[PDB]
């Protein structure tokens, strides 16, 4: 969808896949303010929305935490709390035509700056003059939406680039898109440091024979020390025995 009617899509409860994003060389404008561009798998934003538009040329650079211009006045606006990122694409004959593109529109005439993350779709007359504008195209009554003009050219600033914006929510509900992997296989009968789902310790992971309840994860002793932990891969309970130590 074009900038005049910019489309959004929320991402539901799933495991976020962000590793293949920076590894792709197809992105040339991965500049964004907020969290670090490396700790994406270690984030717990509640909800994520993706907004897409097909703005053209050097107009993309106006996307910043606070900026005014022909694009960020009566269209997609970026506030100072826009936590997330912006991604740009490259245009080609895939989005182009020899005759030209005329099905795309952009707002040009309005009366007041649009609020951040707001859309205003009502296009009859912007009433430049004080004369009545009951729906007759003429002087002091002009149509505020103009069609894009796209032709095969140099492409430095005259191509329909594809720009998406990912926006994150800070804190209104607990998040569900926090997926780490750590890709580690089990080891038994030998001393090892373990980080089983937040339980950091050291010991030997022997074979257990207890009867943990289905909703229980780890056991405990009388003196309140960890004794057994449920590995959530085969859902298996494993005991913990301290490293052998003593005097000489």
């Amino acid at each position, epitope marked *: 969808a074009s900038v005049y009617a910019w489309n959004r899509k929320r991402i539901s409860n799933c495991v976020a896949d962000y590793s293949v994003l920076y590894n792709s060389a197809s992105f040339s404008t991965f500049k964004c303010y907020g969290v670090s561009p490396t700790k994406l798998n270690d984030l717990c934003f509640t909800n994520v929305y993706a907004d897409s538009f097909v703005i053209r040329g050097d107009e993309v650079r106006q996307i910043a935490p606070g900026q005014t211009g022909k694009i960020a006045d009566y269209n997609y606006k970026l506030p100072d709390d826009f936590t997330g990122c912006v991604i740009a694409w490259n245009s080609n004959n895939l989005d182009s035509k020899v005759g*030209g593109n005329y099905n795309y529109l952009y707002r040009l*005439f*309005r009366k*007041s700056n649009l609020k951040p993350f707001e859309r205003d779709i009502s296009t009859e007359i912007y009433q430049a003059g004080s004369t009545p504008c009951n729906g007759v195209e003429g002087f002091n009554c002009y149509f505020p939406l*103009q069609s894009y*003009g796209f032709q095969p050219t140099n492409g430095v600033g005259y191509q329909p680039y594809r720009v998406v914006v990912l926006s994150f929510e800070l804190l209104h509900a607990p998040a569900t898109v926090c997926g780490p992997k750590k890709s580690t296989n089990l080891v038994k009968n030998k001393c090892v440091n373990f980080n089983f789902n937040g339980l950091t310790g050291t010991g030997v992971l022997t074979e257990s024979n207890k009867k943990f309840l289905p909703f229980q994860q780890f056991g405990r002793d009388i003196a309140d020390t960890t004794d057994a932990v449920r590995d959530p891969q085969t859902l298996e309970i494993l005991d913990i025995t301290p490293c052998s130590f003593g005097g000489v």
Partner: single-chain antibody
Amino acid sequence: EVQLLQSAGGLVQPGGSLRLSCAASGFTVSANYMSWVRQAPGKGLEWVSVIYPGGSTFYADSVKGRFTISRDNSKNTLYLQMNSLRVEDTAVYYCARDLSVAGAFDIWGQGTLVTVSSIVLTQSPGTLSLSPGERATLSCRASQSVSSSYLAWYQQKPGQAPRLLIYGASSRATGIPDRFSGSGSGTDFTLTISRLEPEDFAVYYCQQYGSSPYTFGQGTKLEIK
């Protein structure tokens, strides 16, 4: 009947302050585009500032910050305050509404004069002295090779305000006689005037918009052999 009035006919002391004024004659200034252009006598015209609806201020590339432009809806005015003035700032300060996509600078102001103490766009043909009774060709080349419809043509007049001839190089403005034609694509645009009339010998300018700061041509005058 649209009229734009200015009052800036006053010499400025060095390092002094001035206040210009542009009025309105029926159209609200809070809902339309306005632009300021420097006539630069003896050379091509240039850009100064633009005010969108709203009131965000856009300045030219060479000049930054010092010029203070404001819009006053109470008195329907387009005030521009001039700070400390330096050398080589003597020109005219036209103001005009802007509808770049559909009609480029349809109506302009009238003109004034401010004194001092004590995109690569070119026009090819030149003076091209001729006589009435035939046509002529004026070629305007651009380095950035704008795609379709971001170039327009204006007509200067000695002592008067510039007037729009064709917007977008495809269709002429309202009231323009049908003897003006335009063509060309890619890099250059050609303008042709048929059956030249006595009220046609005037300087033609080609200007670019819809891009980095607007640039006008150097100036092509029409003179009789």
